[PDB]
From a paper:
The genome-organizing protein p6 of Bacillus subtilis bacteriophage φ29 plays an essential role in viral development by activating the initiation of DNA replication and participating in the early-to-late transcriptional switch. These activities require the formation of a nucleoprotein complex in which the DNA adopts a right-handed superhelix wrapping around a multimeric p6 scaffold, restraining positive supercoiling and compacting the viral genome. Additionally, p6 forms dimers that bind to DNA every 24 nucleotides and interact with the viral DNA through the minor groove. In this work, we have shown that protein p6 showcases a remarkable evolutionary design that encompasses a folded core as its foundation, upon which, two structural regions play crucial roles in dimerization and oligomerization.
In a first attempt, we removed the final 31 residues (encompassing the α2 together with the C-terminal disordered acidic tail) with the aim of generating a minimal truncated protein fragment suitable for crystallization. After purifying the resulting variant, denoted as p6CΔ31, we efficiently obtained well-diffracting crystals that permitted its structural determination at ∼1.6 Å resolution (experimental electron density is shown in Supplementary Figure S2E). A comparison between the experimental p6CΔ31 structure and the AF2 prediction revealed nearly identical backbone structures, with a rmsd of only 0.664 Å across 53 pruned atom pairs. The folded core of p6CΔ31 assembles into a concave four-stranded antiparallel β-sheet (β1–β4). The central feature of this fold comprises the β1 strand interacting in an antiparallel orientation with the adjacent β2 and β4 at one side, and with β3 on the other. Furthermore, a 12 residues-long α-helix (α1) bridges β3 and β4 strands and packs against β1, β3 and β4. This spatial arrangement builds up a compact and well-ordered core facilitated by the burial of numerous hydrophobic residues (V13, V15, L30, F35, L39, M41, A44, M48, Y52, V57, V59 and V62). In the crystallographic structure of p6CΔ31, residues 1–8 and 68–72, which would extend β1 and β4 strands, respectively, are not visible despite their inclusion in the construct's sequence. This likely results from the absence of stabilizing interactions provided by the α2 within this region when the protein is in a dimeric state (see next section). Further deletion involving the α2 helix (p6CΔ31) completely abolished dimerization (not shown).
Residue numbers in the entry: 8 to 67
The structure:
């Protein structure tokens, strides 16, 4: 496992309706657990309603 892609989404208010917007994926070196990824994304998008969708480790 040499890298981990974290896929992230945001709940957004558009024309008065709650929708979900895809945010840029971020690929980290090494293995990142889902707990680690959730923590990292909560610090990155301070105060905004973001949620980790998935993590994808790649072996090589």
């Amino acid at each position: 496992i040499t890298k981990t892609t974290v896929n992230v989404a945001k709940m957004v208010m558009v024309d008065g309706e709650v929708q979900v917007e895809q945010l840029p994926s971020e690929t980290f070196v090494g293995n990142l657990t889902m707990e680690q990824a959730q923590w990292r994304m909560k610090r990155k998008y301070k105060g905004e309603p973001v949620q980790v969708v998935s993590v994808e480790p790649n072996t090589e």
